[PDB]
Amino acid sequence: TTIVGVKFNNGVVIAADTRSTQGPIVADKNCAKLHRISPKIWCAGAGTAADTEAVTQLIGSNIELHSLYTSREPRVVSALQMLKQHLFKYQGHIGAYLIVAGVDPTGSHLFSIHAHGSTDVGYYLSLGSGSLAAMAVLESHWKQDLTKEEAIKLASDAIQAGIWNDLGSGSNVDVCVMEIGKDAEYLRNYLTPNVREEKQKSYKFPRGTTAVLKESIVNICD
Amino acid sequence: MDIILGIRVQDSVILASSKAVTRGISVLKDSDDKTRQLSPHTLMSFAGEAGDTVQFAEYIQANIQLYSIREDYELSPQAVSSFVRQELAKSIRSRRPYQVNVLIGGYDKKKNKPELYQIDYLGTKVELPYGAHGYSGFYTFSLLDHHYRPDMTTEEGLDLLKLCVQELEKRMPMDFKGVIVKIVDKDGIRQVDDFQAQ
Amino acid sequence: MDIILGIRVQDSVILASSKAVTRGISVLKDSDDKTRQLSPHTLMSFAGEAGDTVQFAEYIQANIQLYSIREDYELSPQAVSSFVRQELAKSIRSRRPYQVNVLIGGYDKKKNKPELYQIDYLGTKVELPYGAHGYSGFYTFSLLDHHYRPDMTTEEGLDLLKLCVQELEKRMPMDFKGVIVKIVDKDGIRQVDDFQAQ
Amino acid sequence: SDPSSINGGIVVAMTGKDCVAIACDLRLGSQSLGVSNKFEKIFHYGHVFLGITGLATDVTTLNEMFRYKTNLYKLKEERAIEPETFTQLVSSSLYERRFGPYFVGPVVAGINSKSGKPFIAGFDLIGCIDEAKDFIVSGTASDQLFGMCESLYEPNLEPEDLFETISQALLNAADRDALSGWGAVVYIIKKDEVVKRYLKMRQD
Amino acid sequence: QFNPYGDNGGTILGIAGEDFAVLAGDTRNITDYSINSRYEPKVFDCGDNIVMSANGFAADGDALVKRFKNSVKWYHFDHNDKKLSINSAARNIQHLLYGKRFFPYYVHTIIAGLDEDGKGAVYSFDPVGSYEREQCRAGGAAASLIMPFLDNQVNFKNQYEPGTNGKVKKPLKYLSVEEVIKLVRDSFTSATERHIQVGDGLEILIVTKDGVRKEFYELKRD
Amino acid sequence: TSIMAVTFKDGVILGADSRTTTGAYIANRVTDKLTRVHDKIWCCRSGSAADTQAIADIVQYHLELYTSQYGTPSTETAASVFKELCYENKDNLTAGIIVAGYDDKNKGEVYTIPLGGSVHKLPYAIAGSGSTFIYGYCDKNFRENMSKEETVDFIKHSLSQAIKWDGSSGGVIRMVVLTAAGVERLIFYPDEYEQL
Amino acid sequence: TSIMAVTFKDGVILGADSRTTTGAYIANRVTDKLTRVHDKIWCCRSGSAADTQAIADIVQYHLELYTSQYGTPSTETAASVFKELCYENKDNLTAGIIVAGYDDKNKGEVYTIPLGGSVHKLPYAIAGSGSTFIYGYCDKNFRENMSKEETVDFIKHSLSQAIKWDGSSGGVIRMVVLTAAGVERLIFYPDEYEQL
Amino acid sequence: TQQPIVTGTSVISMKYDNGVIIAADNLGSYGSLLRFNGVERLIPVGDNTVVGISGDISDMQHIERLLKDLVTENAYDNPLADAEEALEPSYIFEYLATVMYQRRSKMNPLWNAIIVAGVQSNGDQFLRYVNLLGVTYSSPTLATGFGAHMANPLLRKVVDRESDIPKTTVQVAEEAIVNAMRVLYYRDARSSRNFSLAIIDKNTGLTFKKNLQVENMKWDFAKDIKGYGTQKI
Amino acid sequence: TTTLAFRFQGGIIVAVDSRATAGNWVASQTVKRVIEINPFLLGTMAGGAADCQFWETWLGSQCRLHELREKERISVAAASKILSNLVYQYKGAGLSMGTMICGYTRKEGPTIYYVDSDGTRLKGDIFCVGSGQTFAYGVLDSNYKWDLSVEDALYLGKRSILAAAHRDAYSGGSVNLYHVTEDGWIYHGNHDVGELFWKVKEEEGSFNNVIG
Ligand SMILES: [Mg+2]
Ligand SMILES: [Mg+2]
Ligand SMILES: [Mg+2]
Ligand SMILES: [Mg+2]
Ligand SMILES: [Mg+2]
Ligand SMILES: [Mg+2]
Ligand SMILES: [Mg+2]
């Protein structure tokens, strides 16, 4: 769990690692903490996984229904308000913190919601265990008005921060970009710093090493 | 806990079940049958929480008998035990679970073979050659693993079981006041009432 | 708890004491004498905490025998029990108390009469016609209140006691594995070893 | 005070070049006392496979619940449930009971009858989806399994070899876990044919 | 209240080679979800061709080693620099360790070397004193991820001779040091991949009839 | 947490910090603790984050709805709305919340709805994690109503010292001017107040 | 509880209230919280009653014994004596204790030995149940050293507001003037400070 | 057992081509209060050592005493006390550690996180942690309690490893370490603005750079933030 | 853990498993649970490794002192008593340990004393301690007789321990066997349960329920 988001002169970018823990164990070496609420509004979420997903699924689901009916377009705060009204209706019992971000027919947007109903706003937000390292990085290298290149470069180098100095996070980097006029590009694994080196020996076994007592050919259809 | 045993043999099943009843200190009845015949060929021994026990059994019993006259056709041991497990499965997540463990012995007439199902209060079922809920297994399971053969006669089984008992007596702290034994077969149910003089 | 009985009669005293030993679940030995002759005419049955029990008894024993050869004169049941109580009295306010209850049976040779003292681990003594530590009293005390007579023969006593036993078996949850019985009289101590075939 | 850890059991799956595999132990018992050695944690719904670890009744209840639903799907849709589809389902299902969770650890795996693409997944008791391309492990000895799999998985094995690998992976991790064993069984899923095998192991 | 204990991760490993011995164990050091030092040795030579290592709680650990390295020194002073047969050292440690029975040393300790015949020898320790002559033991956080493996690879557990049906188990054979170190590195990498408390580097002390050798190999800074 | 609201001759102005802390860490050192419910009615949130946030949302709703039928509402008419919310749920709520608003007629009013739900119209109120040291200053250095700029200092120095001794409260200062004129959005960067 | 000590041009003077509370009740609303250890060395006790009282007694002893052989002792020489007592026993002691003393040479010194045992020479210190609201005033309204009468006011007003917002601290005020001149025993009755 | 009363926050440090650095603000907190705006957290020992202490001041003050008191104790009967035979950093620390342990081992510790820095007579860099638990470790970078979570990150961007020390200029060390100090003040309630930094270079020696301010901060952008989601105007 | 010992016509028989275990994971299957106190005595190992191991060796020393003083073999009863007294010294402190102290003296004949951390000294003819103590007491109770072929006694021991191993998850590995006589003890090697099981089920015909 280590994520951030930073808006530039014509949009906003959120990134998150790809490692999911489980106490001291690594469950998934490749997970996507970046989910789509709607084409232009996306989320990154930390804390309790199943919570974070299902919840966006829910909201994305409704917001679609909304836009259709309204014939207009998805506003960012619509998503925000939806989330935190339900989110808090369950006074904390749904651990999910997240950086909600997208673009609506009125501007670029970026917010952070806590698991209890708290919502904030700034130009850059970090949520997760390594929220401190990636915070420290953005709190020295940030200047108003950065570009598709400046901002990007940064976001990814913030994430990198957590990946290294914090245990609860690792593997590759996930990124998504929303531009005030343009589309949205999902870049699964913009980076790949961590890669296992080629092993020492070949562990493939010689056929027939395992002892078998019985065997057959199980059934399927009618 | 109490004693509940059961063993599947040749063309029958055998259920053992201690007789004593305890209220903290004194022992009230000591000639108590923890049994309840569900249908002519199905039977169920049980042990569990004081009230939870006898209520649940009768209740299960009710449903069955109902089904059996409604349909006029009898229900199979397999399916029976499935339903019992169903009920306990819910029971466990109910506002108040019936804390009760059971053994279900029956003679499946279509297969013309005897089946025995062990089921704990959590709703955990399994067809077995023999079983025992609670601490009862620890003391005996070995002897069974040892001498048991699928082909044993009805008598062979009794002897075995009889031996398991002698052991339970010898190393168990509690005085279970003996056992009532019963047999389910192609003929139905009868009680080995003789296990007092035997 | 275990079983510790004692009954004073005509020109003797009788001590009963269950035989089983338990470690949580299994039963180790079941032919265990919870006795310890202190002197030729004094004797002590006991029940208590697992370690506390057997250590204390022997320790008490030691002191006595010591006194008895030093002086060459034997010590009186009365005085003995006084000392035991002393030790426990201190024991109870010690950094760690020996949790142990006891019965002390002896034949006071000067008075030519049998004395019996019951004493709990708190250091509570009392000369009694009969007694039993722990839950043991509850089940029996009545029968004794009933049939007991000071004049009873040695045999009379056994029968009584035997009846108390049959009861303890019938209404006690635990299996005490029988009892070892013993008699203290003008002749000294002997064991009614026959209470297995009797 | 953990439920998952009461009954025992493990399940593991791997993806080979054009096929899959999934195996589990056989033991079932209340903590110390072993009870059964014929209790299987793997079943299927037509061509889809599910392995479930965790709490025994909850396992059974789930199988029943799924057999139920897949039958009803295939009926109104005149076609058997697809892997990817099933996943998304069993996922939601677990969640519907997010406040009275089922104490289990499922693992799905199969072969998509259209693309022909091998599939594997794993989830926590509430339906969080773990999409993987190598292996999935759930159960008591979860940690021991990752130790095996990490060494032994080799991208794209031949079915005949994959069997040998997974077998050994399961088999060996099972011996360092006190609560799993008493036999095991491995299935090998090809486009068409499927082979079930029981293996010999320590019975302690 | 005051909690006098702590965990600093770490994983060590000891294999008793036919006529050698290895004691490997990584260089990472942790607290909660943070890092302390990328490089921090847990394995040491204590002279008399004897290696040690105590993993669990650093402080109790290094104190024991220190407390031991001194007890070796004093052994020479009183017996005219007689060499400490490894077996002896262990009986000695038992005591040291048992000295603090009712306030133990929160650590799994291991030593390795050679007996009075030239055979490799490892020794695993309880956190209070029980010692066993092990020919192979992994202790530490990752423990349960490597022990299953060596089980298999080092003792060919569950591996039979093909075509024998399952009647002929594959015979053990003793592997050269090279062979062993290949196994060991693989073990650790696999472990680092799936265990957060493990990574960074690997320092190996190899014992042989003419000294102590040290070889290091870098792991992933995941 | 560190908020307040002060009344004077042209009305009333409320100000607060930006610092919000989760444990000894700074979550967002740039908080808009001052919140708008109606055009000439605002409030400063104290205590719990999530709670205070949602309360407002609801209130904002009631009022923006009141107007559409019962005309424009008072400042007292607004306080009572929080009274209800705060009270009813005193068990699942942590809120210090201070309310302020102006109306040409009754000038600007100041009401504090502290924890529990008890309401108060005072000359000026002060709540929040670091209110504890300005009981000395505030009360003592308080003249009955002042001038626009004249008042801006009470705010300025009251707020300044509160940062100086209470870590849980800090960041920048932010004021909101509610007058006949209208709303004015203030902001006093660090190197300033510290100098004083 | 509400004490302190302030230094200036002629030395230093320490003052405190009289109010001591057991629960919400006033045990003795007339306490001599200012205590003498040596002729030109005194102290004001904070926190626990029984403890602070006994500490002093001991110290008074050490010093009155020091002199009889090592001449007259410093103000720093005295603080260290409390340092030991306070520290060693931090587990069975509750003491806020502020120390003050004067010597012609180094003027008057102010040291505070708060809970824990940490010692401090400051311009002036303030401890006690109600110190919490004068972090605003004190610091802000503090000119480097003043005059006898000039200073008497810091004391007077700092102490006044502390009564005004902290019930656990009240009663009358009492000051102790330590100078070249000598010791002067002050006392400012109620109707006075309240007026201010 | 016991509990901490007054608290020193963090203490950051790192090595470079010639020597080492160690900073630590001058704040001693009393819970959430800041009862002490200017307090010393850096005791230099000899002229080749300094000790950044973080935790309880009452305890920290005790140690100081143990140092000065140990220092004055080295002199005693030994002429070379200012050259050949004189306290190296490695020593003090060794003795320090020894102590911290006996303490936890006696169920009564000193609530402190400590860093020992300096340079060995023979020219080597020294940097080692040691806390109330009696735990220790070397590393190119080191920070107490709050530091390590937030400082260490940046300090590791300058020196990812031991193979970078040789090429770590005294100036690059400084500015970076101060940027870190700005950050510690940006997001930590327990931190102060005034502080004390110290350098121990094998060439120049000890350079106690006491009392400084943290300058250059981007706050302006504050004005742009309004509400928390909807609040526009 | 499953340890046991019993007396018979030929002397004493001791049998153990070898599975150590931390929580759910198996820490080792190579455990020596029989403490060779000295050439003529043996102590089993229940309770907690270090305690049994340590004290029982301490005890071994103690005998050597006595014996040398007396120029006579130390008698079981005493040896056991001593351990007991030492253990009692620590009742309350947290010492945990079950154990059979077995010997065969000139006079005493074969003799077992079960001893535990609670100070229970117990003379007996059969003892099982551990997790599997329950299943092992099964096989033993039925099959025991005092006149066993020296070899059958050895076999009973194996099989008994084997029952426990199968069922009791916390017990297993390999079995260790020792026989004791008037002139000292004799090891009867190690037996991998894995291999052995398959053998027994085969020869003995027992363990039917098991597949394959
Ligand atoms: Mg990491
Ligand atoms: Mg697991
Ligand atoms: Mg196993
Ligand atoms: Mg030697
Ligand atoms: Mg502040
Ligand atoms: Mg007052
Ligand atoms: Mg087992």
Swiss-Prot record, chain E:
GO biological process: proteasomal ubiquitin-independent protein catabolic process; proteasome-mediated ubiquitin-dependent protein catabolic process
This protein's UniProt keywords: Cytoplasm, Nucleus, Proteasome
Annotated compartments: Cytoplasm; Nucleus
Protein role: Non-catalytic component of the proteasome which degrades poly-ubiquitinated proteins in the cytoplasm and in the nucleus. It is essential for the regulated turnover of proteins and for the removal of misfolded proteins. The proteasome is a multicatalytic proteinase complex that is characterized by its ability to cleave peptides with Arg, Phe, Tyr, Leu, and Glu adjacent to the leaving group at neutral or slightly basic pH. It has an ATP-dependent proteolytic activity.
PANTHER family according to UniProt: METALLOPROTEASE TLDD (PTHR32194), PROTEASOME SUBUNIT BETA TYPE-1 (PTHR32194:SF2)
Quaternary state and interactors: The 26S proteasome consists of a 20S proteasome core and two 19S regulatory subunits. The 20S proteasome core is composed of 28 subunits that are arranged in four stacked rings, resulting in a barrel-shaped structure. The two end rings are each formed by seven alpha subunits, and the two central rings are each formed by seven beta subunits. The catalytic chamber with the active sites is on the inside of the barrel.
Name by which UniProt lists this protein: Proteasome subunit beta type-6
Organism listed in the record: Saccharomyces cerevisiae (strain ATCC 204508 / S288c) (Baker's yeast)
Curated annotation (Swiss-Prot), chains F, G:
Top-rank EC class of the record's enzyme: hydrolase
InterPro entries, A to Z: Ntn_hydrolases_N (IPR029055), Pept_T1A_subB (IPR000243), Proteasome_bsu_CS (IPR016050), Proteasome_sua/b (IPR001353), Proteasome_suB-type (IPR023333)
Pfam families, A to Z: Proteasome
Alphabetical GO biological process terms: proteasomal ubiquitin-independent protein catabolic process; proteasome-mediated ubiquitin-dependent protein catabolic process
Quaternary structure and partners: The 26S proteasome consists of a 20S proteasome core and two 19S regulatory subunits. The 20S proteasome core is composed of 28 subunits that are arranged in four stacked rings, resulting in a barrel-shaped structure. The two end rings are each formed by seven alpha subunits, and the two central rings are each formed by seven beta subunits. The catalytic chamber with the active sites is on the inside of the barrel.
Protein family: Belongs to the peptidase T1B family.
Protein name as it appears in the record: Proteasome subunit beta type-1
Organism the protein comes from: Saccharomyces cerevisiae (strain ATCC 204508 / S288c)
Taxonomic placement: Eukaryota, Fungi, Dikarya, Ascomycota, Saccharomycotina
Gene: PRE3
Curated annotation (Swiss-Prot), chain H:
SUPFAM superfamilies assigned: N-terminal nucleophile aminohydrolases (Ntn hydrolases)
InterPro entries: Ntn_hydrolases_N (IPR029055), Proteasome_beta4 (IPR016295), Proteasome_bsu_CS (IPR016050), Proteasome_sua/b (IPR001353), Proteasome_suB-type (IPR023333)
Keywords from the UniProt entry: Cytoplasm, Nucleus, Proteasome
Family matches, as Pfam families: Proteasome
Subcellular localization, as worded in the UniProt entry: Cytoplasm; Nucleus
Complex formation: The 26S proteasome consists of a 20S proteasome core and two 19S regulatory subunits. The 20S proteasome core is composed of 28 subunits that are arranged in four stacked rings, resulting in a barrel-shaped structure. The two end rings are each formed by seven alpha subunits, and the two central rings are each formed by seven beta subunits. The catalytic chamber with the active sites is on the inside of the barrel. Interacts with CIC1.
Family as reported in the entry's similarity comment: Belongs to the peptidase T1B family.
Note: Present with 16900 molecules/cell in log phase SD medium.
Name under which the protein is recorded: Proteasome subunit beta type-7
Designated gene of the protein: PRE4
Curated annotation (Swiss-Prot), chain I:
Cellular component GO terms held in the UniProt record: cytosol; nucleus; peroxisome; proteasome complex; proteasome core complex, beta-subunit complex
Effect noted on mutating residue 51 to N: In DOA3-1; decrease in activity
Active site per the UniProt annotation: 1
Reaction catalysis annotation: Cleavage of peptide bonds with very broad specificity
Protein family according to the UniProt entry: Belongs to the peptidase T1B family.
Note in the entry: The side chain of Thr-1 acts as a nucleophile, and the N-terminal amino group acts as a proton acceptor. Present with 8530 molecules/cell in log phase SD medium.
Functional summary from the UniProt entry: The proteasome degrades poly-ubiquitinated proteins in the cytoplasm and in the nucleus. It is essential for the regulated turnover of proteins and for the removal of misfolded proteins. The proteasome is a multicatalytic proteinase complex that is characterized by its ability to cleave peptides with Arg, Phe, Tyr, Leu, and Glu adjacent to the leaving group at neutral or slightly basic pH. It has an ATP-dependent proteolytic activity. This unit is responsible of the chymotrypsin-like activity of the proteasome and is one of the principal target of the proteasome inhibitor bortezomib. This subunit is necessary for chymotryptic activity and degradation of ubiquitinated proteins.
Name of the protein in its database record: Proteasome subunit beta type-5
Organism of origin: Saccharomyces cerevisiae (strain ATCC 204508 / S288c) (Baker's yeast)
Range within the parent protein: 76 to 287 of 287
